[PDB]
């Protein structure tokens, strides 16, 4: 009567975020003690975000709107270490606010498909005033967007609908290989996350193939593995918001050149879902439960997960 959920999917797809959400919804959520602990992390991620944008203007060769603010950039790298202990200096806040408002920097941000910009960046940079207060304690939402480097295996557990859920994020933990492999053992359902908004990303120097196609190949491997013939496959097409905004401007032909359909969000998403679900080569013997998520939307994730649980229960009544 125990349920083992395993999150898979490429980097920056929503896994850790979904775990955090699971904490917020089915655990008590995050206590103010912990929220305090995440302050430094927030300031940090904000800093690395704006920095990354700046280095990006470097490599793409884009000059600021007002060349004056450039000095703050020079200043920023020095003031960068001013968060580690605590409290972002109001001087630093003024560096960030000045750089982020600069239409030259924005022009680089709106070209984030050409480099590697964090997806939590905007969330922080737009909410700068709220967090630059010295009396600031982070919102649960603020903690959701925190990006923590993973030591090894992430795992949360909770009780829901008279069931015990153990949920694992095995990602990247090149060590402890026995505990790492045991995460793939006796899995009730795999939750594969796909970042939809990665469709328009430019082929990087280090990839053999487009990012979305990398995720597809990975899904092909997972889905049609003889070990998982008796495992439910749940597909989270995530980052649907960013996909909806992006699809207005950037054609899907960027990523699927053979795509002859229209550029409506709904038709495109359907095409991607088709592309992934077609990879199931045991189509009759196995069905794929597909959902379209926005992992930062707690309400959405709560709903989707409820639905998943319902499917699990219905599969239990079959037994």
């Amino acid at each position: 009567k125990e349920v083992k959920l395993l999150l898979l999917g490429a980097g920056e797809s929503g896994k850790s975020t979904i775990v955090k959400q699971m904490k917020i919804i089915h655990e008590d959520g995050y206590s103010e003690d912990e929220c305090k602990q995440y302050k430094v992390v927030v300031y940090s991620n904000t800093i690395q975000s704006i920095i990354a944008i700046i280095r990006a203007m470097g490599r793409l060769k884009i000059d600021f709107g007002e060349a004056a603010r450039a000095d703050d950039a020079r200043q920023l790298f020095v003031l960068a270490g001013s968060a580690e202990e605590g409290v972002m200096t109001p001087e630093l806040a003024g560096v960030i606010k000045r750089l982020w408002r600069d239409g030259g920097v924005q022009a680089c941000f709106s070209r984030s498909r050409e480099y590697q910009l964090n997806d939590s960046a905007s969330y922080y940079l737009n909410d700068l005033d709220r967090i630059s207060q010295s009396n600031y304690i982070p919102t649960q939402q603020d903690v959701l967007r925190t990006r923590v480097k993973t030591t090894g295996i992430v795992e949360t557990h909770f009780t829901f609908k008279d069931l015990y859920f153990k949920m694992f994020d095995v990602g990247g933990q090149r060590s402890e290989r026995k505990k790492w492999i045991h995460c793939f053992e006796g899995v009730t359902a795999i939750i594969f996350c796909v970042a939809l908004s990665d469709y328009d990303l430019v082929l990087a120097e280090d990839e053999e193939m487009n990012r979305m196609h990398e995720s597809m190949k990975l899904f092909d491997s997972i889905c049609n593995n003889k070990w998982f013939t008796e495992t439910s496959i749940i597909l989270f097409l995530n980052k649907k918001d960013l996909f909806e905004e992006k699809i207005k401007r950037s054609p899907l032909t960027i990523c699927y050149p053979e795509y002859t359909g229209s550029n409506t969000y709904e038709e495109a998403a359907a095409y991607i879902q088709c592309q992934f679900e077609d990879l199931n080569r045991r189509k009759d013997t196995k069905e794929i439960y597909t959902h379209f998520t926005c992992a930062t939307d707690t309400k959405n994730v709560q709903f989707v997960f409820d639905a998943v649980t319902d499917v699990i229960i219905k599969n239990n009544l079959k037994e």
């Binding site: 430094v40 492999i181 491997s221």
Partner: peptide
């Protein structure tokens, strides 16, 4: 080949623009 693929692909999660405890 499978596990290697997983480790390879799951690790690119942008290590800059991230922090530890």
């Amino acid at each position: 080949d499978f596990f290697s693929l997983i480790l390879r692909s799951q690790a690119k999660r942008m290590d800059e623009q991230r922090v530890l405890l």
